[PDB]
Structures are given as C-alpha cells and as structure tokens.
PDB file of C-alpha atoms in Angstrom:
ATOM      1  CA  UNK A   1      19.210  30.535   8.825  1.00 48.73           C
ATOM      2  CA  UNK A   2      17.639  27.060   8.982  1.00 45.35           C
ATOM      3  CA  UNK A   3      16.941  24.407  11.606  1.00 44.45           C
ATOM      4  CA  UNK A   4      17.798  20.793  12.050  1.00 46.07           C
ATOM      5  CA  UNK A   5      15.771  17.720  12.938  1.00 44.70           C
ATOM      6  CA  UNK A   6      13.939  17.506  16.297  1.00 44.90           C
ATOM      7  CA  UNK A   7      11.711  14.546  17.436  1.00 47.01           C
ATOM      8  CA  UNK A   8      11.478  11.013  16.081  1.00 48.88           C
ATOM      9  CA  UNK A   9       9.287   9.833  13.130  1.00 48.92           C
ATOM     10  CA  UNK A  10       5.526   9.808  14.116  1.00 51.07           C
ATOM     11  CA  UNK A  11       2.714   9.112  11.656  1.00 53.30           C
ATOM     12  CA  UNK A  12       0.498  12.219  11.275  1.00 51.11           C
ATOM     13  CA  UNK A  13      -2.268  10.913   8.895  1.00 49.40           C
ATOM     14  CA  UNK A  14      -1.564   7.267   9.377  1.00 48.55           C
ATOM     15  CA  UNK A  15      -2.679   4.454   7.141  1.00 51.36           C
ATOM     16  CA  UNK A  16      -6.443   4.073   6.410  1.00 47.82           C
ATOM     17  CA  UNK A  17      -8.527   1.214   5.219  1.00 44.32           C
ATOM     18  CA  UNK A  18      -7.663   0.950   1.448  1.00 46.82           C
ATOM     19  CA  UNK A  19     -10.427  -0.530  -0.511  1.00 47.43           C
ATOM     20  CA  UNK A  20      -9.665  -1.235  -4.194  1.00 49.75           C
ATOM     21  CA  UNK A  21     -10.783  -3.660  -6.953  1.00 46.73           C
ATOM     22  CA  UNK A  22      -9.139  -6.904  -7.899  1.00 44.08           C
ATOM     23  CA  UNK A  23      -6.599  -6.657 -10.749  1.00 43.90           C
ATOM     24  CA  UNK A  24      -5.890  -3.064 -10.159  1.00 42.81           C
ATOM     25  CA  UNK A  25      -2.814  -1.796  -8.208  1.00 43.14           C
ATOM     26  CA  UNK A  26      -3.546  -0.747  -4.609  1.00 42.81           C
ATOM     27  CA  UNK A  27      -1.574   2.328  -3.527  1.00 44.44           C
ATOM     28  CA  UNK A  28      -1.354   3.351   0.120  1.00 43.63           C
ATOM     29  CA  UNK A  29       0.399   6.412   1.611  1.00 47.67           C
ATOM     30  CA  UNK A  30       1.108   8.043   4.953  1.00 48.60           C
ATOM     31  CA  UNK A  31       2.696  11.300   6.232  1.00 48.27           C
ATOM     32  CA  UNK A  32       5.693  11.331   8.574  1.00 49.61           C
ATOM     33  CA  UNK A  33       6.532  13.859  11.259  1.00 47.22           C
ATOM     34  CA  UNK A  34      10.084  13.741   9.936  1.00 50.06           C
ATOM     35  CA  UNK A  35      11.930  12.603   6.792  1.00 53.05           C
ATOM     36  CA  UNK A  36      13.204   9.102   7.348  1.00 55.00           C
ATOM     37  CA  UNK A  37      13.253   5.681   5.701  1.00 56.47           C
ATOM     38  CA  UNK A  38      10.206   3.621   6.485  1.00 55.08           C
ATOM     39  CA  UNK A  39       9.242  -0.049   6.002  1.00 54.29           C
ATOM     40  CA  UNK A  40       6.054  -1.826   4.897  1.00 54.32           C
ATOM     41  CA  UNK A  41       4.864  -5.206   5.935  1.00 54.66           C
ATOM     42  CA  UNK A  42       2.067  -7.463   4.881  1.00 53.85           C
ATOM     43  CA  UNK A  43       1.128 -10.004   7.428  1.00 51.37           C
ATOM     44  CA  UNK A  44       4.072 -12.188   8.582  1.00 55.65           C
ATOM     45  CA  UNK A  45       6.654 -10.741   6.042  1.00 57.91           C
ATOM     46  CA  UNK A  46       8.415  -7.541   5.193  1.00 59.40           C
ATOM     47  CA  UNK A  47       7.412  -6.080   1.878  1.00 60.99           C
ATOM     48  CA  UNK A  48      10.249  -5.449  -0.539  1.00 63.40           C
ATOM     49  CA  UNK A  49      10.866  -3.433  -3.726  1.00 65.88           C
ATOM     50  CA  UNK A  50      11.352  -5.500  -6.887  1.00 67.11           C
ATOM     51  CA  UNK A  51       8.800  -8.263  -6.721  1.00 70.87           C
ATOM     52  CA  UNK A  52       5.366  -6.987  -7.692  1.00 71.38           C
ATOM     53  CA  UNK A  53       5.884  -4.234  -5.107  1.00 71.27           C
ATOM     54  CA  UNK A  54       7.021  -0.616  -4.960  1.00 73.31           C
ATOM     55  CA  UNK A  55       8.295   0.820  -1.765  1.00 74.15           C
ATOM     56  CA  UNK A  56       9.352   4.410  -2.030  1.00 73.10           C
ATOM     57  CA  UNK A  57       8.967   7.620   0.097  1.00 70.98           C
ATOM     58  CA  UNK A  58       9.631  11.336  -0.726  1.00 70.10           C
ATOM     59  CA  UNK A  59      10.974  13.500   1.947  1.00 68.61           C
ATOM     60  CA  UNK A  60       8.170  12.952   4.652  1.00 67.11           C
ATOM     61  CA  UNK A  61       5.699  10.973   2.436  1.00 64.83           C
ATOM     62  CA  UNK A  62       5.494   7.276   2.029  1.00 63.76           C
ATOM     63  CA  UNK A  63       3.803   5.411  -0.843  1.00 65.66           C
ATOM     64  CA  UNK A  64       3.412   1.694  -1.090  1.00 65.81           C
ATOM     65  CA  UNK A  65       2.332  -0.128  -4.368  1.00 67.98           C
ATOM     66  CA  UNK A  66       1.027  -3.630  -4.776  1.00 68.77           C
ATOM     67  CA  UNK A  67       0.826  -4.629  -8.486  1.00 66.20           C
ATOM     68  CA  UNK A  68      -1.607  -7.506  -8.981  1.00 64.39           C
ATOM     69  CA  UNK A  69      -4.349  -7.015  -6.422  1.00 69.86           C
ATOM     70  CA  UNK A  70      -6.056 -10.247  -5.123  1.00 70.91           C
ATOM     71  CA  UNK A  71      -8.625 -11.413  -2.574  1.00 69.34           C
ATOM     72  CA  UNK A  72      -5.726 -12.832  -0.551  1.00 68.98           C
ATOM     73  CA  UNK A  73      -3.871  -9.580  -0.515  1.00 65.82           C
ATOM     74  CA  UNK A  74      -6.646  -7.846   1.270  1.00 64.42           C
ATOM     75  CA  UNK A  75      -5.879  -8.182   4.945  1.00 65.73           C
ATOM     76  CA  UNK A  76      -3.782  -5.815   7.080  1.00 63.17           C
ATOM     77  CA  UNK A  77      -0.722  -3.788   6.129  1.00 62.17           C
ATOM     78  CA  UNK A  78       1.664  -2.389   8.761  1.00 60.46           C
ATOM     79  CA  UNK A  79       4.105   0.465   8.401  1.00 63.59           C
ATOM     80  CA  UNK A  80       7.165   0.643  10.624  1.00 62.33           C
ATOM     81  CA  UNK A  81       9.744   3.457  10.528  1.00 58.84           C
ATOM     82  CA  UNK A  82      11.497   3.258  13.876  1.00 56.39           C
ATOM     83  CA  UNK A  83       9.681   3.205  17.151  1.00 57.10           C
ATOM     84  CA  UNK A  84       6.147   3.912  15.935  1.00 57.84           C
ATOM     85  CA  UNK A  85       4.074   1.572  13.733  1.00 55.57           C
ATOM     86  CA  UNK A  86       0.633   1.834  11.953  1.00 53.89           C
ATOM     87  CA  UNK A  87      -1.755  -0.647  10.562  1.00 52.02           C
ATOM     88  CA  UNK A  88      -4.714  -0.671   8.207  1.00 51.99           C
ATOM     89  CA  UNK A  89      -7.135  -3.222   6.557  1.00 48.20           C
ATOM     90  CA  UNK A  90      -7.189  -3.599   2.760  1.00 47.60           C
ATOM     91  CA  UNK A  91     -10.189  -4.814   0.757  1.00 42.80           C
ATOM     92  CA  UNK A  92     -10.093  -6.314  -2.707  1.00 45.09           C
ATOM     93  CA  UNK A  93     -13.355  -6.766  -4.592  1.00 45.46           C
ATOM     94  CA  UNK A  94     -12.939  -9.914  -6.815  1.00 47.04           C
ATOM     95  CA  UNK A  95     -13.695  -8.837 -10.379  1.00 46.58           C
ATOM     96  CA  UNK A  96     -17.141 -10.093 -11.677  1.00 43.54           C
ATOM     97  CA  UNK A  97     -16.674 -13.380 -13.496  1.00 47.55           C
ATOM     98  CA  UNK A  98     -17.430 -12.237 -17.093  1.00 47.37           C
ATOM     99  CA  UNK A  99     -16.806 -13.369 -20.663  1.00 46.41           C
ATOM    100  CA  UNK A 100     -15.673 -11.693 -23.924  1.00 48.02           C
ATOM    101  CA  UNK A 101     -17.802 -11.581 -27.091  1.00 47.80           C
ATOM    102  CA  UNK A 102     -16.553 -11.106 -30.639  1.00 48.44           C
ATOM    103  CA  UNK A 103     -19.527  -9.027 -31.731  1.00 45.86           C
ATOM    104  CA  UNK A 104     -23.293  -8.679 -31.206  1.00 44.28           C
ATOM    105  CA  UNK A 105     -24.296  -8.286 -34.903  1.00 45.47           C
ATOM    106  CA  UNK A 106     -22.686  -8.876 -38.253  1.00 47.46           C
ATOM    107  CA  UNK A 107     -22.205  -6.768 -41.396  1.00 45.74           C
TER     108      UNK A 107
END
C-alpha cells in the first residue's frame, strides 16, 4: 500500500540570498526532506504570524512573508525545523527618493 515517515527533516534546497526592493514584500521558501512544522527567525528573535509577517508551510514546503520591506530588514534569516538549521542574507534596495507631480501640461 503506502509507506510511513523515515529520517528527520533536512533542507534540500535551503534558503538563498533573497534580494528585493524596499516597500515590496519579500518572500522566501525552502524545501523539506519531510513534512513538519518549521520556524523562521530574523536576527535575535523568532518570527511570528500575525504582525506584518506570514509563516506557513504546505506539506514539505516552507514560505515566509515579510510585509513592509526595509533597509533594516535586510540582514540574515534563519530557518529551524528540528535539528537542522539554514540561513541566508536578505538585501533591500531603498526606493529612490522621488516626488509626485500633478501634471506636465494643462488643457
């Protein structure tokens, strides 16, 4: 018929340097050798779902979301599931200080 679950949870693809643009919403993902609840961390704190953050994983796929990208956010995100742990640097290009204009010409 079917099989069970053998071996712990090990990152297959692992997290890679995610470079996005300020303002946008960075989205990182990583494959898992097995289906299990993982955890995301940003520096000296454990990310959580509810505050400008979305932590969810489908079967054996993790996907972290960080609404409100900033220059400070860009650093190093770590993912912990059980015994193994991965890390990756995130870059955030600060939007070019621009201005808004009503209109070039009139008519």
